[PDB]
Design a protein around this ligand. Structure first.
Ligand SMILES: [Mg+2]
Ligand SMILES: [Mg+2]
Ligand code: NA
Lengths: 113, 113
């Protein structure tokens, strides 16, 4: 439990998604991991890994990161989601909560605008 | 909608701090409200309002908002803290957790090294 490790784990999460390394993805998530965004909540690590492996509406995407912000126990990542042609799907701020060195929850926020 | 209500409440928080409207500030917080950042946690609504009124190193600051990002149940506000002369103290992302019609927790995040 330190700030630098939390940031490194957040960076590893995006690397897992973008490299389609779902072994790495599982390795950085708690069993009871929950992902939230306005239009979708995905509950549980195995459901989440399956969704990212098999069910994302856009394939071969990336998450360029603009700025990472550190809090007392959480990390907020400001970035964008790009499709395979570099086109912006959305901007986001993802807020990571941690338990035991792994990610317990990610709350995705999109511009109001 | 509840989502619109949460965004309005987050905006009202900054309006209150900046106008020193501590009556309004009280009105938007949970009784057991917690404000978080690295090396400072402030607990309790009356105690927090009293901190903002009396104990801040600078009370004549402003919090111009750049972008509000909305999540499933939380709001992430990207802004800057300016001193009375308009100079930047820090960039921040504040993450608002809501409960029972009011703000339960704000987690302040500042840019990583
Ligand atoms: Mg006084
Ligand atoms: Mg002023
Ligand atoms: Na920080």
């Amino acid at each position: 439990s330190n700030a630098m490790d939390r940031v490194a784990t957040a960076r590893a999460y995006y690397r897992a998604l973008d490299e389609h390394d779902y072994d790495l993805l599982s390795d950085v998530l708690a069993p009871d991991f929950v992902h939230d965004r306005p239009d979708r909540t995905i509950e549980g690590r195995e459901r989440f890994v399956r969704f990212m492996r098999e069910e994302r509406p856009q394939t071969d995407t990336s998450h360029p990161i603009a700025t990472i912000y550190t809090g007392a126990s959480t990390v907020a990542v400001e970035g964008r989601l790009l499709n395979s042609d570099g086109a912006e799907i959305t901007q986001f701020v993802d807020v990571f909560a941690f338990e035991d060195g792994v990610i317990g929850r990610i709350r995705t926020h999109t511009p109001e605008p």
